[PDB]
Amino acid sequence: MSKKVLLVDDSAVLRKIVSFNLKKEGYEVIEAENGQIALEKLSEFTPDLIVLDIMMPVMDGFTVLKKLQEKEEWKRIPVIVLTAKGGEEDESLALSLGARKVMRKPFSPSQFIEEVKHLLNE
């Protein structure tokens, strides 16, 4: 049904499966193959939740989170980071870089959704 989600990942295989789980709960989703695309797609509308991963080619997840947290409309839109980097420093570099939740990869889709639910229902 209602809530939108911007899903940003240089991975197609991963976008598919994250998307499948999202729409299974009603949400609609807009993909973003990278950081540039992510923001280009963003000047157009405002997602109610964002799913961002870190390592990608044109512009990375770190810079993306940055531009988010330095702008008034964007500051407030919650972000779940999905990264393969577990190193608990990376997590702080992410929360301090704006993120509202960090989730390690590999991840449980059910948990992930369980997280995506709470963040849409604060």
Partner: protein, 237 residues
Amino acid sequence: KRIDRMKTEFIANISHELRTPLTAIKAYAETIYNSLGELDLSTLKEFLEVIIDQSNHLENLLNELLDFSRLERKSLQINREKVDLCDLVESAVNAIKEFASSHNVNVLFESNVPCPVEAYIDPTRIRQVLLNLLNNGVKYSKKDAPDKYVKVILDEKDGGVLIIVEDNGIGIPDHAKDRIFEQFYRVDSSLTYEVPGTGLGLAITKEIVELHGGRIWVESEVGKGSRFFVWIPKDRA
């Protein structure tokens, strides 16, 4: 031997590189498992082959660790036979066009000698050597360009075949040019901190070639791309 600082980061690379496919496997499997209601046969089978394809990625990465060990033990052999090199490279080309497209890469096989080309080497290990440079060609390329290819050129040279692997991609600095063939080496740059890379591909390739009593070497500058030459004598001795 700074080999002990390098194998330390080679450890974290094995980590990162294996957990990408493992992330697909878990996510897809848990999904199928939890969403039989909301899957149609066509998606089911699709998710199942995702699991299968990611497994095979993971199997190849494990094969690399294996090969390497068998090499750094001086304990691996070649079994040479009469191979039509022209097919072997194309069978190889055909074996990449997936990866190729996933990165918007055209794959080219050119011939400068006539194409029934005969050879006395091991098709398996050479097919492997091909796939190694081909891959790296796709894997290392212009992050945004329409022009991009990977070009395999067959040739004979000095009573011995000369295969070249040209890319139009991202290329390599001089200081690194000689150290790219070692165990564990990876060209670190803010440009490509992203690439899954083991740092063993070329180490396994050099070794495999230098057992056919041949050589591998490189030309490149930081803008045009890169050339890989594998000189391999028609029949060794």
